[PDB]
Amino acid sequence: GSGMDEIVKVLSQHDRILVVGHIMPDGDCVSSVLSLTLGLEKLGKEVKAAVDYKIPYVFEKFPYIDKIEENPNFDPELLVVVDASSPDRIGKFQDLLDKVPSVVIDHHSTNTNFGNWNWVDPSFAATAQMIFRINKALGVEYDSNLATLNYLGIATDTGFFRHSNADVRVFEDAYKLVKMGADAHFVAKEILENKRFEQFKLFAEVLERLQLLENGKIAYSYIDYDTYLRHNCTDEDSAGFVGELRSIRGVEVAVLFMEFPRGKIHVSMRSKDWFNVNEVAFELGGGGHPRAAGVTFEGKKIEEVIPRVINHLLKKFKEGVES
Amino acid sequence: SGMDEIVKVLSQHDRILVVGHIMPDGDCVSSVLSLTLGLEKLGKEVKAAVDYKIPYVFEKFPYIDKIEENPNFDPELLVVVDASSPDRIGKFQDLLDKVPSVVIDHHSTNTNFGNWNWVDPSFAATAQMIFRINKALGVEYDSNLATLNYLGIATDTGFFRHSNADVRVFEDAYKLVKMGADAHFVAKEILENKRFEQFKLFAEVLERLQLLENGKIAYSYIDYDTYLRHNCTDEDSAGFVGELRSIRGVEVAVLFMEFPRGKIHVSMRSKDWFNVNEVAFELGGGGHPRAAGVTFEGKKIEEVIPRVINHLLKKFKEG
Ligand SMILES: [Ca+2]
Ligand SMILES: [Ca+2]
Ligand SMILES: [Mn+2]
Ligand SMILES: [Mn+2]
Ligand SMILES: [Mn+2]
Ligand SMILES: [Mn+2]
């Protein structure tokens, strides 16, 4: 629909701007929201940042993290929606879409182009890369704090330069930002080395319960609610567990069953090279992306949800192995 | 002492053996192979060796079979990369009183055991020094050589997570990816290749994990019987101590490892300020400000652990 130049001109034409990110905010969301907000503020615009969700604790030390609001009181001329592929993903702020002109900036190919202006380019690994280019086009001078905030999303959305999307442009952007003072160590420490001690004792139980299925192609484990309690943990402590189980040699699908609170079992699935876990997840009542999906069961017994999910996963997997 | 001197020595010799440290890591493999392939571009006869089994995670890398264990060779020059002392190259230290030697390394504790020593602790990886040597030698990089040279920069920075991941690290990474370094291949092979048995071993490491200095220090240990119980080797525990440092508030993580039997290794990683190389040096080892280790021979793990902890705590309070 629109290109960066059109977005830059729209941003220049408006002064009271609300920058909105997607719910359940990750590094790229926080990075893209704050990097654009601060850039626009440096231009003298009246800007507020909003995400309809609690900002996770791992961001607590980041400069200007306080600028992201859950309940802003603001009368914007322009809504800028970043890193969100559809209106439901910005929560209660979608109710502004028919009241305020909107810009969309996103790297998700599934983006519905729900804005009055839409710059969507999936060749970027992170929306933060697109914000970096917008700020440059606007003449934003980066300091170390803004460089760190813009580096954040490029790091997290590439798995810290490990995913298949970490191409030359990603590494060029990272080099440029570190040269401007981005604190790569700070970012990694706060995002990746911020685990409660109790999470490690919980993870030990996960690993003791770990089992492989179907020629070591499927790995699964489970956390019952009483095991969370025993280690003084919640589902906040176990978020990164399923991705670790995917790193087993030969495993194509990792599955983790997580009962928290009691009776509520969330099932996370991650795949590696080819298996579309979103299809299995959707058929079980959930959904997601081809390599990362999930499904929630409410008011059920974990010992009954595990067979239910594994039986269907195994059927779909063998069907996929065949043709 | 400087790169230019090393380049001159390398140019003078046409039969060269390139050796790295035992218990090889990514920087060792990267530096050995990148320099070996670079020197071959000059028409030289070059062999690569490590006196140790090459870990499984490297087996799909291009030219990995060029690293030998028992080279059949009469070199004119020995080039030692990424090793801080003669003991760390195993049987090849026997060459040091016979063949002229070059040392290229980034450990602050290097004993300068070569005839020529280029030691620069400001580099995050020896592989950064090899990259510069190769370009000074005039070598042109194809994508396989770029991948091999990228490897060590990635692994010795914990894939751009350690405090040594500075602007020069990101410059080198960008330049190598621009020349075809497959960053994703490197990450998959090194980080997504864990044996199932490694996770069972790690579970015991986590069961034994303890905090000291009221949360600022974390440590665990693997006695030899526990490696055997889980059908594991030092290959399986390679990344463990870095994981222990990911505890919120921990400044230094320590892992004691007995492998093979009668070889007790201490691996230390620190986060923000504690100089673990000072501790390691005083115990007979060495390393970098944020990553260091020592190996003890003929000791009992039940005696090594409390004495090392005691010294670590002494140095921590002095820090
Ligand atoms: Ca103004
Ligand atoms: Ca908060
Ligand atoms: Mn995001
Ligand atoms: Mn994103
Ligand atoms: Mn090394
Ligand atoms: Mn090294």
Side-chain angles (χ1 to χ4, degrees), chain A residues 26-28 107-108 123-126 129 152-171 191-192 240 242-244 246-247 270-273 289 291-292, chain B residues 150 154 158-161 177 181-192:
Chain A
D26 53 29
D28 195 23
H107 68 105
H108 295 94
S123 77
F124 287 107
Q129 290 181 276
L152 166 64
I154 301 174
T156 59
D157 248 23
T158 60
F160 286 77
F161 308 100
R162 290 168 43 170
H163 297 350
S164 64
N165 59 4
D167 63 5
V168 63
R169 186 166 58 177
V170 160
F171 280 95
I191 299 301
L192 302 175
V242 67
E244 283 294 331
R246 174 174 47 195
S247 68
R270 304 290 182 268
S271 49
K272 184 170 291 168
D273 290 325
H289 310 291
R291 297 296 171 276
Chain B
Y150 173 92
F159 286 79
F160 312 100
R161 287 152 233 201
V177 171
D182 191 338
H184 178 51
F185 170 85
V186 171
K188 281 200 307 186
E189 291 305 304
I190 300 304
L191 300 178
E192 294 177 29

Side-chain angles (χ1 to χ4, degrees), chain B residues 54-70:
Chain B
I54 298 303
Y56 168 95
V57 293
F58 300 110
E59 281 185 5
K60 291 191 184 162
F61 277 78
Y63 301 107
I64 188 63
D65 284 312
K66 288 185 74 73
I67 308 183
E68 307 179 47
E69 185 150 9
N70 310 297

Side-chain angles (χ1 to χ4, degrees), chain B residues 161-182:
Chain B
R161 287 152 233 201
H162 300 341
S163 67
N164 60 6
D166 63 8
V167 64
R168 201 165 46 175
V169 157
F170 284 93
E171 175 191 337
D172 294 349
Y174 158 65
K175 286 174 159 174
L176 288 162
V177 171
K178 194 178 169 186
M179 294 191 291
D182 191 338

Side-chain angles (χ1 to χ4, degrees), chain A residues 151 160 162 164 171 185 189 192-196 200-201 204 207-208 210 244 247-249, chain B residues 56 150 161 163 170 184 191-195 199-200 206-207 209 245-248 271-272:
Chain A
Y151 172 92
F160 286 77
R162 290 168 43 170
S164 64
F171 280 95
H185 177 240
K189 178 175 47 156
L192 302 175
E193 305 192 344
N194 220 335
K195 306 168 179 154
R196 301 194 319 119
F200 288 75
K201 302 292 186 180
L207 300 182
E208 282 167 9
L210 179 60
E244 283 294 331
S247 68
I248 300 166
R249 187 189 308 166
Chain B
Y56 168 95
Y150 173 92
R161 287 152 233 201
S163 67
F170 284 93
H184 178 51
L191 300 178
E192 294 177 29
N193 233 349
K194 302 178 179 162
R195 289 171 71 243
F199 284 85
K200 299 298 180 178
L206 297 177
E207 290 288 310
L209 179 67
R245 194 185 67 200
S246 69
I247 301 157
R248 177 182 302 164
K271 189 169 279 167
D272 288 315

Side-chain angles (χ1 to χ4, degrees), chain A residues 13-32:
Chain A
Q13 294 166 324
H14 297 87
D15 197 71
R16 294 172 284 292
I17 300 176
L18 183 64
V19 179
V20 174
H22 64 72
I23 57 189
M24 286 169 180
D26 53 29
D28 195 23
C29 176
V30 169
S31 177
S32 295

